[PDB]
Design an enzyme around this catalytic site. Structure first.
Site, PDB file in Angstrom:
ATOM      1  N   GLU A 359      42.478  -1.187 -13.591  1.00 40.25           N
ATOM      2  CA  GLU A 359      43.234  -2.008 -12.717  1.00 40.25           C
ATOM      3  C   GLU A 359      44.465  -1.073 -12.159  1.00 40.25           C
ATOM      4  O   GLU A 359      45.006  -0.052 -12.878  1.00 40.25           O
ATOM      5  CB  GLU A 359      44.105  -3.116 -13.365  1.00 40.25           C
ATOM      6  N   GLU A 364      54.625  -3.773  -9.272  1.00 41.03           N
ATOM      7  CA  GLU A 364      54.965  -5.035 -10.291  1.00 41.03           C
ATOM      8  C   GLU A 364      56.452  -5.021 -10.500  1.00 41.03           C
ATOM      9  O   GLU A 364      57.226  -3.969 -10.187  1.00 41.03           O
ATOM     10  CB  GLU A 364      54.296  -4.800 -11.425  1.00 41.03           C
ATOM     11  CG  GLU A 364      53.042  -5.639 -11.706  1.00 41.03           C
ATOM     12  CD  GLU A 364      52.247  -5.215 -13.002  1.00 41.03           C
ATOM     13  OE1 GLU A 364      52.134  -4.043 -13.368  1.00 41.03           O
ATOM     14  OE2 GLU A 364      52.266  -6.116 -13.818  1.00 41.03           O
TER      15      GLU A 364
HETATM   16  O1  LIG Z   1      39.557  -9.653 -19.903  1.00 38.68           O
HETATM   17  C1  LIG Z   1      40.022  -9.943 -21.409  1.00 38.68           C
HETATM   18  C2  LIG Z   1      41.289  -9.381 -21.726  1.00 38.68           C
HETATM   19  O2  LIG Z   1      42.486  -9.960 -20.856  1.00 38.68           O
HETATM   20  C3  LIG Z   1      43.680  -9.723 -20.951  1.00 38.68           C
HETATM   21  O3  LIG Z   1      44.172 -10.409 -19.881  1.00 38.68           O
HETATM   22  C4  LIG Z   1      44.350  -9.374 -18.622  1.00 38.68           C
HETATM   23  C5  LIG Z   1      45.682  -9.294 -18.370  1.00 38.68           C
HETATM   24  O4  LIG Z   1      46.257  -8.531 -19.295  1.00 38.68           O
HETATM   25  C6  LIG Z   1      45.604  -8.637 -17.033  1.00 38.68           C
HETATM   26  O5  LIG Z   1      47.070  -8.420 -16.754  1.00 38.68           O
HETATM   27  C7  LIG Z   1      47.326  -7.695 -15.627  1.00 38.68           C
HETATM   28  C8  LIG Z   1      47.849  -6.461 -15.847  1.00 38.68           C
HETATM   29  O6  LIG Z   1      47.097  -5.632 -16.919  1.00 38.68           O
HETATM   30  C9  LIG Z   1      47.786  -5.961 -14.339  1.00 38.68           C
HETATM   31  O7  LIG Z   1      47.679  -4.737 -14.415  1.00 38.68           O
HETATM   32  O8  LIG Z   1      48.972  -6.520 -13.744  1.00 38.68           O
HETATM   33  C10 LIG Z   1      48.668  -7.526 -13.282  1.00 38.68           C
HETATM   34  C11 LIG Z   1      49.374  -8.473 -12.177  1.00 38.68           C
HETATM   35  O9  LIG Z   1      50.930  -8.315 -12.929  1.00 38.68           O
HETATM   36  C12 LIG Z   1      48.295  -8.537 -14.638  1.00 38.68           C
HETATM   37  O10 LIG Z   1      47.809  -9.812 -14.193  1.00 38.68           O
HETATM   38  O11 LIG Z   1      44.956  -9.318 -16.152  1.00 38.68           O
HETATM   39  C13 LIG Z   1      43.419  -9.130 -16.534  1.00 38.68           C
HETATM   40  C14 LIG Z   1      42.623  -9.446 -15.184  1.00 38.68           C
HETATM   41  O12 LIG Z   1      43.031 -10.920 -14.713  1.00 38.68           O
HETATM   42  C15 LIG Z   1      43.371  -9.898 -17.693  1.00 38.68           C
HETATM   43  O13 LIG Z   1      41.982  -9.730 -17.959  1.00 38.68           O
HETATM   44  C16 LIG Z   1      44.317 -10.063 -22.222  1.00 38.68           C
HETATM   45  O14 LIG Z   1      45.604  -9.921 -22.361  1.00 38.68           O
HETATM   46  C17 LIG Z   1      43.407  -9.434 -23.294  1.00 38.68           C
HETATM   47  O15 LIG Z   1      43.764 -10.016 -24.622  1.00 38.68           O
HETATM   48  C18 LIG Z   1      42.019  -9.890 -23.193  1.00 38.68           C
HETATM   49  O16 LIG Z   1      40.943  -9.202 -24.124  1.00 38.68           O
HETATM   50  O1  LIG Z   2      52.376  -7.104 -20.165  1.00 37.01           O
HETATM   51  C1  LIG Z   2      51.948  -6.525 -18.813  1.00 37.01           C
HETATM   52  C2  LIG Z   2      52.392  -5.580 -18.142  1.00 37.01           C
HETATM   53  O2  LIG Z   2      52.496  -4.400 -19.367  1.00 37.01           O
HETATM   54  C3  LIG Z   2      53.446  -3.338 -18.794  1.00 37.01           C
HETATM   55  O3  LIG Z   2      53.749  -2.335 -19.786  1.00 37.01           O
HETATM   56  C4  LIG Z   2      54.995  -2.602 -20.451  1.00 37.01           C
HETATM   57  C5  LIG Z   2      54.983  -3.879 -21.061  1.00 37.01           C
HETATM   58  O4  LIG Z   2      54.634  -3.974 -22.114  1.00 37.01           O
HETATM   59  C6  LIG Z   2      56.783  -3.792 -21.309  1.00 37.01           C
HETATM   60  O5  LIG Z   2      56.949  -4.983 -22.053  1.00 37.01           O
HETATM   61  O6  LIG Z   2      57.422  -3.618 -20.345  1.00 37.01           O
HETATM   62  C7  LIG Z   2      57.423  -2.051 -19.835  1.00 37.01           C
HETATM   63  C8  LIG Z   2      58.354  -1.901 -18.757  1.00 37.01           C
HETATM   64  O7  LIG Z   2      58.616  -0.451 -18.446  1.00 37.01           O
HETATM   65  C9  LIG Z   2      55.958  -2.263 -19.219  1.00 37.01           C
HETATM   66  O8  LIG Z   2      55.609  -0.776 -18.817  1.00 37.01           O
HETATM   67  C10 LIG Z   2      52.908  -2.795 -17.682  1.00 37.01           C
HETATM   68  O9  LIG Z   2      53.589  -1.842 -17.208  1.00 37.01           O
HETATM   69  C11 LIG Z   2      52.474  -3.681 -16.440  1.00 37.01           C
HETATM   70  O10 LIG Z   2      51.609  -3.261 -15.550  1.00 37.01           O
HETATM   71  C12 LIG Z   2      51.643  -5.020 -17.257  1.00 37.01           C
HETATM   72  O11 LIG Z   2      51.459  -6.096 -16.072  1.00 37.01           O
END
Ligand SMILES: OC[C@H]1O[C@@H](O[C@@H]2[C@@H](O)[C@H](O[C@@H]3[C@@H](O)[C@H](O)O[C@H](CO)[C@H]3O)O[C@H](CO)[C@H]2O)[C@H](O)[C@@H](O)[C@@H]1O
Ligand SMILES: OC[C@H]1O[C@@H](O[C@@H]2[C@@H](O)[C@H](O)O[C@H](CO)[C@H]2O)[C@H](O)[C@@H](O)[C@@H]1O
Length: 479
Positions: A359, A364
């Site tokens: 991803e 963000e």
């Molecule tokens: O697929 C199973 C796995 O899913 C996890 O959920 C994830 C999310 O953590 C993830 O969150 C995104 C960030 O990682 C991304 O890079 O930034 C975006 C936007 O802010 C977030 O939505 O999204 C993905 C894809 O939808 C989800 O799969 C669970 O936390 C984990 O336990 C689980 O195993």
């Molecule tokens: O929890 C989802 C987000 O996680 C972020 O990683 C860090 C966080 O776990 C923490 O709580 O805050 C810091 C701020 O510096 C984050 O870097 C990811 O950066 C995000 O992409 C993600 O959505």
């Protein structure tokens, strides 16, 4: 001839910076000095049938078409010049061979037959002076354009007025479209003309967003009062580095986001982060395009099992891509509890579900910390579930009240992250496999999450709704 091969056309000469008078020898020479592709000017004809150069029909209160040229000589321009004759203008431009002379015949306020005669005289004057190679023609009067093309079959002629089809113009042997830039903000005007072989010019483009917009879509010319700023903008635009636009949504439609570009992620099941919002399906209350940008609106509104509604738009299986420059211009929603994101997921997940296929978070932001905008990559080895995600944060001045450009440049061996062309993060391909580098084919997601494991750590300020993320455009360039 050492013709300048750039997009800059100096509207009325290069007059504004050095405070020269418009449509003057001074402003034309300044346009030659700058290296403009062309210098643009306006032609009327006196009552005694002498062609002169002036935008307005009245030169200092004298109606050009109804007075003798001698009468106009009782007036003097700001730098001391008199109203230039066309002859003097064409001879001044003849003294150099690098910038074109873009001649506009103004529609006559007297009669169509008079203005056809003006056109006859303009073409004769170009021929008598043998400057047929410098001169290119534009006009608001479609009849004058076609009359030029009768008299000069290989002449470059573009139409200014806007209400003739690109298909008809090519039929009548015109070579370019030259509309006010607002005209192009309807369905594929630019691509349409280029498909048909017409050059594309746009007038008066003085502000940077429209400059960068017209350059992204690779128009041929831009007529501007700000040619020096335009040269600066050309140097820093993605086309200068070899990027070519592959896909854009400029959000110039009105209503719901285009179905050819966007699908909806729908549901309120937490989205893997225990988020508080229900993402709705094609609901103008949470996703609406108006006034040139996408609006994603989070609402304090019960729907099914959740207390908030919002939108999550994806280009998955509508535009999917590998490598490129991704550029999103956006104004963020203000408020503790909010979690807007501009990011990308793999279309096919060739290595398994998240995080195994990666991803990329282009932008963000969590509203409880206003001074940070974050970019992050997530891979099987480098992700937030195991606290190994690779990311950095930049302070952004005024994130809620002005647009900023959130961008990535994604190559075979690295990804660069930018906020307003400040590079702040590089994720390098370690070349140790797909757990380190899963990047081979992704799509775009725009969303406004409420709460969640990151965004909700300090609660939700329930006073901030309705909360709007504004997106001016999504543009994807590739080499
Ligand atoms: O697929 C199973 C796995 O899913 C996890 O959920 C994830 C999310 O953590 C993830 O969150 C995104 C960030 O990682 C991304 O890079 O930034 C975006 C936007 O802010 C977030 O939505 O999204 C993905 C894809 O939808 C989800 O799969 C669970 O936390 C984990 O336990 C689980 O195993
Ligand atoms: O929890 C989802 C987000 O996680 C972020 O990683 C860090 C966080 O776990 C923490 O709580 O805050 C810091 C701020 O510096 C984050 O870097 C990811 O950066 C995000 O992409 C993600 O959505």
């Amino acid at each position: 001839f050492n013709w300048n091969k750039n997009q800059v056309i100096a509207h009325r000469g290069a007059w504004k910076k050095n405070n020269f008078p418009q449509n003057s020898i001074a402003s034309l020479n300044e346009a030659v000095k700058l290296g403009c592709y062309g210098s643009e000017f306006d032609v009327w004809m006196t009552a005694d049938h002498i062609l002169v150069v002036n935008h307005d029909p009245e030169f200092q209160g004298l109606t050009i078409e109804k007075v003798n040229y001698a009468d106009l000589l009782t007036k003097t321009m700001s730098n001391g010049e008199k109203i230039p004759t066309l002859e003097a203008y064409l001879l001044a431009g003849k003294k150099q061979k690098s910038t074109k002379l873009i001649l506009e015949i103004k529609p006559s306020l007297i009669s169509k037959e008079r203005g056809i005669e003006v056109t006859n005289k303009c073409v004769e004057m170009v021929q008598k002076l043998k400057v047929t190679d410098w001169v290119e023609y534009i006009s608001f009067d479609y009849d004058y354009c076609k009359r030029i093309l009768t008299l000069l079959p290989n002449a470059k002629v573009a139409y200014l007025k806007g209400e003739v089809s690109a298909e008809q113009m090519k039929a009548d042997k015109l070579t370019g479209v030259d509309y006010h830039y607002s005209v192009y903000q309807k369905d594929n005007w630019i691509e349409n003309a280029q498909k048909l072989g017409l050059t594309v010019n746009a007038w008066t483009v003085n502000a940077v967003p429209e400059m960068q917009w017209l350059l992204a879509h690779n128009v041929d010319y831009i007529t501007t009062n700000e040619p020096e700023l335009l040269f600066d903008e050309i140097k820093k635009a993605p086309v200068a580095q070899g990027w070519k636009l592959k896909w854009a949504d400029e959000f110039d439609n009105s209503g719901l986001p285009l179905n050819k570009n966007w699908g909806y992620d729908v549901g309120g099941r937490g989205w893997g982060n225990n988020e508080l919002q229900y993402y709705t399906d094609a609901d103008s209350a949470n996703a609406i395009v108006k006034k040139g940008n996408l609006n994603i609106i989070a609402l304090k509104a019960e729907k099914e099992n959740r207390h908030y509604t919002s939108a999550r738009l994806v280009t998955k299986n509508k535009f999917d891509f590998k490598y490129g420059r991704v550029e999103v211009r956006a104004m963020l929603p203000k408020g503790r509890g909010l979690w807007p994101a501009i990011w990308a997921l793999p279309t096919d997940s060739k290595y398994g579900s998240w995080p195994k296929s990666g991803e990329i978070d282009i932008m963000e932001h969590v509203g409880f910390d206003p001074d940070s905008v974050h970019g992050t990559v997530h891979t099987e080895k480098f992700n937030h579930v195991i606290h190994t995600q690779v990311g950095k944060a930049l302070k952004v001045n005024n994130p809620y009240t002005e647009y900023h450009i959130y961008a990535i440049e994604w190559f075979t061996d690295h990804i660069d992250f930018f906020i307003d062309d400040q590079k702040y993060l590089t994720f390098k391909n370690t070349q140790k496999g797909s757990g380190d580098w899963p990047f081979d084919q992704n799509f775009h997601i725009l969303n406004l999450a409420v709460g969640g494991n990151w965004g909700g750590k300090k609660g939700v300020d329930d006073a901030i709704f309705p909360a709007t993320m504004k997106v001016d455009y999504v543009r994807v360039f590739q080499k």
